[PDB]
Amino acid sequence: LSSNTWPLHSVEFLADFKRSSTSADATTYDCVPFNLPRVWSLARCYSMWKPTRWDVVYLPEVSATVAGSIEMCFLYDYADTIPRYTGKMSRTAGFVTSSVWYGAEGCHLLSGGSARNAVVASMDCSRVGWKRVTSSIPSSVDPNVVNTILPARLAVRSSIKPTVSDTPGKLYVIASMVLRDPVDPTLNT
Amino acid sequence: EMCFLYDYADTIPRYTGKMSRTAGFVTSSVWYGAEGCHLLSGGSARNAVVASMDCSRVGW
Amino acid sequence: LSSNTWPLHSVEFLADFKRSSTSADATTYDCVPFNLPRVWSLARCYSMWKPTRWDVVYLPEVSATVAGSIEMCFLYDYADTIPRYTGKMSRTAGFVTSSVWYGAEGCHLLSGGSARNAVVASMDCSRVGWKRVTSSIPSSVDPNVVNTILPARLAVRSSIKPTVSDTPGKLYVIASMVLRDPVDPTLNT
Amino acid sequence: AEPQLQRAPVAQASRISGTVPGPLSSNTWPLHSVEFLADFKRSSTSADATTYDCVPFNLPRVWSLARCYSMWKPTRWDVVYLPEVSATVAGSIEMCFLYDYADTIPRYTGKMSRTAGFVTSSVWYGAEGCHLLSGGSARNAVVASMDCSRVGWKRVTSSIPSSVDPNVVNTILPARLAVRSSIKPTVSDTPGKLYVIASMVLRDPVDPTLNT
Amino acid sequence: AEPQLQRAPVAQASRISGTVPGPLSSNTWPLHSVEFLADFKRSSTSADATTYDCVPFNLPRVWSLARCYSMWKPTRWDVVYLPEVSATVAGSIEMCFLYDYADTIPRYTGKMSRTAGFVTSSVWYGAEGCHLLSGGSARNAVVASMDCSRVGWKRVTSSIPSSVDPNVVNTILPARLAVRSSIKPTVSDTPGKLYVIASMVLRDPVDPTLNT
Amino acid sequence: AEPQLQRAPVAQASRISGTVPGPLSSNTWPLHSV
Numbered sequence: 001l002s003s004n005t006w007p008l009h010s011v012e013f014l015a016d017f018k019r020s021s022t023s024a025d026a027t028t029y030d031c032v033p034f035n036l037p038r039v040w041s042l043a044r045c046y047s048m049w050k051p052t053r054w055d056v057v058y059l060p061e062v063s064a065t066v067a068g069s070i071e072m073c074f075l076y077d078y079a080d081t082i083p084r085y086t087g088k089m090s091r092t093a094g095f096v097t098s099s100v101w102y103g104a105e106g107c108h109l110l111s112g113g114s115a116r117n118a119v120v121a122s123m124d125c126s127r128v129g130w131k132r133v134t135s136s137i138p139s140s141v142d143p144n145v146v147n148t149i150l151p152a153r154l155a156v157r158s159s160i161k162p163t164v165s166d167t168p169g170k171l172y173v174i175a176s177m178v179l180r181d182p183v184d185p186t187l188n189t
Numbered sequence: 190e191m192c193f194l195y196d197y198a199d200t201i202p203r204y205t206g207k208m209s210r211t212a213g214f215v216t217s218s219v220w221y222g223a224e225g226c227h228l229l230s231g232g233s234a235r236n237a238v239v240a241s242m243d244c245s246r247v248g249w
Numbered sequence: 250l251s252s253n254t255w256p257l258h259s260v261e262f263l264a265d266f267k268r269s270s271t272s273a274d275a276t277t278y279d280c281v282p283f284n285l286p287r288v289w290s291l292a293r294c295y296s297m298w299k300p301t302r303w304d305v306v307y308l309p310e311v312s313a314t315v316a317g318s319i320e321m322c323f324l325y326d327y328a329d330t331i332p333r334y335t336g337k338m339s340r341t342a343g344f345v346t347s348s349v350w351y352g353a354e355g356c357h358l359l360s361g362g363s364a365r366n367a368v369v370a371s372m373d374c375s376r377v378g379w380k381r382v383t384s385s386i387p388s389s390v391d392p393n394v395v396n397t398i399l400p401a402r403l404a405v406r407s408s409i410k411p412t413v414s415d416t417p418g419k420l421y422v423i424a425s426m427v428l429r430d431p432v433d434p435t436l437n438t
Numbered sequence: 439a440e441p442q443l444q445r446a447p448v449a450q451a452s453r454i455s456g457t458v459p460g461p462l463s464s465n466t467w468p469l470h471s472v473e474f475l476a477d478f479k480r481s482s483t484s485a486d487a488t489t490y491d492c493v494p495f496n497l498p499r500v501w502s503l504a505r506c507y508s509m510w511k512p513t514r515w516d517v518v519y520l521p522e523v524s525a526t527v528a529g530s531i532e533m534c535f536l537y538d539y540a541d542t543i544p545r546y547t548g549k550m551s552r553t554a555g556f557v558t559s560s561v562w563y564g565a566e567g568c569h570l571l572s573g574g575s576a577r578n579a580v581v582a583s584m585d586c587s588r589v590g591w592k593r594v595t596s597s598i599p600s601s602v603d604p605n606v607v608n609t610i611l612p613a614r615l616a617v618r619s620s621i622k623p624t625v626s627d628t629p630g631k632l633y634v635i636a637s638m639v640l641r642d643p644v645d646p647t648l649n650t
Numbered sequence: 651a652e653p654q655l656q657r658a659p660v661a662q663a664s665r666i667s668g669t670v671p672g673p674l675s676s677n678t679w680p681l682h683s684v685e686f687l688a689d690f691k692r693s694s695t696s697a698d699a700t701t702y703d704c705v706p707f708n709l710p711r712v713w714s715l716a717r718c719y720s721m722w723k724p725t726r727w728d729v730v731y732l733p734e735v736s737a738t739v740a741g742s743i744e745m746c747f748l749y750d751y752a753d754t755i756p757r758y759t760g761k762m763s764r765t766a767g768f769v770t771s772s773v774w775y776g777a778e779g780c781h782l783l784s785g786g787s788a789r790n791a792v793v794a795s796m797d798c799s800r801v802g803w804k805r806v807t808s809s810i811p812s813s814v815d816p817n818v819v820n821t822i823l824p825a826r827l828a829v830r831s832s833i834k835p836t837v838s839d840t841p842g843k844l845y846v847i848a849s850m851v852l853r854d855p856v857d858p859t860l861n862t
Numbered sequence: 863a864e865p866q867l868q869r870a871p872v873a874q875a876s877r878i879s880g881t882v883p884g885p886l887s888s889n890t891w892p893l894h895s896v
């Protein structure tokens with residue numbers, strides 16, 4: 001309800017699903033407001049935030065004959081190593097893989113929501129507490145310090161290496177959060 | 190990519206990020222959504238690519 | 250509650266109450282999100298807004314010996330002439346006046362409630378419809394065009410011409426609104 | 439019957455939803471176990487208590503399972519002392535828990551007694567604690583229980599950042615068990631054993647090889 | 651449940667059968683309406699009757715709907731005269747229908763009377779015709795009915811080829827209403843109003859912008 | 863009713879199992895004659 005607490009449901013483009021022709025490493029995305037321009041514009045006006053939903057849906061835009069799959073999972077510890085292959089991915093939390101060309105049915109999740117044959121990677125938000133809204137990540141520090149601000153990292157991996165670097169789809173985030181103690185957007189770091 | 194602009198003064202999105210941040214946003218494989226043909230007659234928007242405009246609160 | 254809609258309660262510094270040593274005219278403030286940095290940072294992420302509250306509190310910060318008083322009222326039509334004197338101010342909506350050094354007791358209004366000894370000028374928000382959020386105002390246009398985006402103007406006046414321009418207190422806005430259709434903050438005009 | 443005229447699709451989505459099935463694939467996994475913690479070492483020169491980090495990687499068997507999950511939350515953690523000395527042995531064992539890495543390790547009985555979870559026992563008392571490790575009956579056991587209520591979800595690590603601000607260590611270390619000897623024998627000895635009866639909940643799987 | 655492994659087809663036919671659904675998409679559409687036709691203008695110099703082409707595009711509201719169809723067939727077409735003058739006004743209104751564009755417009759009572767659908771009335775008679783425009787009761791109304799039986803399906807046009815053989819005009823013009831004043835006032839005047847009570851059937855839709 | 867939106871497959875197997883039907887297609891055929 002109220003008393004220094006504003007609930008928020010947003011949908012925003014997160015990033016392009018990029019496939020490397022050389023690296024087998026997954027690309028990680030920090031599940032924090034400053035990574036979503038519009039949501040950041042809102043969140044930066046508050047000192048604290050608490051994710052309630054945070055779901056990343058993959059929407060493809062390539063031929064149905066393209067080869068490969070997209071793999072997704074969430075990493076809840078910054079200290080944890082970024083998956084360099086399918087098993088590592090298949091073994092971790094929120095795992096989900098689907099042919100790179102599949103997914104369009106997920107557009108219904110964006111507008112409204114009837115996730116059926118949607119390719120989503122849901123983050124474990126239950127038991128995720130009030131974190132401090134920051135404008136950056138102290139990567140140069142002990143992973144434990146980072147954990148303080150990073151609820152989780154989305155790991156996205158190309159099941160295979162295309163002959164040329166490419167992007168067969170896009171990742172959109174459907175976030176739901178509550179914001180708490182106001183701050184001047186310009187002083188929020 | 191489809192979305193609705195409710196203020197003529199607002200700038201037309203020039204890219205995916207901008208489009209996604211706009212009301213009524215929707216995207217689809219250009220080859221997805223043929224089932225939308227049945228929408229034009231009966232119904233079943235289950236597998237259709239539709240961009241709905243916020244009509245509630247729109248006055249006379 | 251949902252689907253392009255969430256209430257927003259905010260408090261922000263509006264402007265310094267400036268007393269002209271030569272002019273008797275009232276200063277005018279446009280009651281729109283873009284005139285409140287933080288609130289603007291939020292409202293700009295939406296296409297439409299609807300004021301639910303909008304109250305401006307006068308909080309003094311001068312000696313109990315300063316003479317003169319502050320006068321406030323709201324103008325709901327851009328075409329309407331700005332009050333030149335006390336009688337005029339007194340005859341317009343939301344009119345309130347108070348000795349320039351009184352009003353400190355209204356600080357709990359900023360956090361909590363009890364406008365019991367406050368110097369507030371409340372805008373009539375009931376029956377104020379959805380207005381498009383704008384980054385500016387067409388000041389050289391027909392007032393009716395302006396009225397489209399301007400719910401009202403706060404008119405502040407000094408009941409006295411001090412020997413030298415001075416600012417006896419400040420005006421703080423206590424706004425409560427609902428925003429509606431998402432829009433990229435950078436594309437909002 | 440008639441041979442079926444299969445229609446060949448341009449492709450066919452290959453999809454898997456959720457962590458691949460197996461022993462530790464559930465979102466969460468509760469685990470209870472008895473784990474040998476350490477020997478109750480009695481220094482003959484130092485009066486300082488010995489510290490033990492109450493974290494999964496310090497429990498060999500539990501760690502095997504725990505490293506497959508990224509988050510854990512202690513629910514029980516109880517350390518039982520088992521005497522292996524005669525009733526002629528003088529001395530006492532002192533145990534308590536330290537919930538802030540920045541806090542100083544007690545160097546004497548008074549300090550130990552003023553600390554949470556404090557407990558003392560004749561070094562030759564508590565053999566009945568053997569039955570605790572299996573069935574139950576902590577009636578006559580020497581146990582040091584860690585305050586687990588209010589302990590939140592901690593990240594599972596394979597190490598402790600020791601030369602770092604105690605505050606960052608606290609983010610991973612729910613508590614430390616402090617074990618002290620009430621007296622200094624003429625020569626270092628080992629009056630008994632310390633076994634941990636841990637109970638925890640693991641959450642959010644992760645490839646073990648990535649877990650650090 | 652299990653994620654469904656969708657089979658992607660080389661394509662997927664996009665098909666629509668029949669005029670897209672909406673207000674005027676039916677093969678045929680019947681429409682009844684009251685439409686103001688014109689003022690009963692009484693010339694003070696000419697004895698010639700005034701002609702009115704009984705075609706859809708001459709009925710503003712009806713035309714709005716009619717232009718969405720390519721074919722129409724009149725079913726009723728009745729023109730009611732409404733007096734707006736006192737019972738002291740001399741003169742009569744004469745009405746009849748001309749079913750051949752090549753036919754000469756009557757210049758006098760005798761000619762008018764010899765023409766189909768003929769009718770005359772004291773210019774101040776027929777106010778009860780007001781009730782016709784709504785409910786009914788043509789008992790005391792001055793009405794000129796057009797012979798609609800036997801009128802076939804006509805193409806809907808937005809114009810009349812006037813400087814063309816009357817025979818080609820006939821293909822589009824079911825009939826003309828001829829209105830005449832039995833007398834010449836000292837100066838042109840307007841004793842009443844002419845309202846049409848049309849009933850027609852529209853058939854075979856067409857984009858309005860193409861309809862001409 | 864609604865026109866059915868046929869899904870076109872890359873192909874479609876053309877298959878026949880067993881000797882094409884007719885008078886002498888059976889695995890065996892008994893015959894008696896003068």
Ligand SMILES: [Ca+2]
Pocket residue numbers: 047132133134135188189
């Ligand atoms: Ca901050």
Ligand SMILES: [Ca+2]
Pocket residue numbers: 196198199296381382383384437438
């Ligand atoms: Ca705008």
Ligand SMILES: [Ca+2]
Pocket residue numbers: 077079080508593594595596648649650
């Ligand atoms: Ca870890």
Ligand SMILES: [Ca+2]
Pocket residue numbers: 720805806807808860861862
């Ligand atoms: Ca036509």
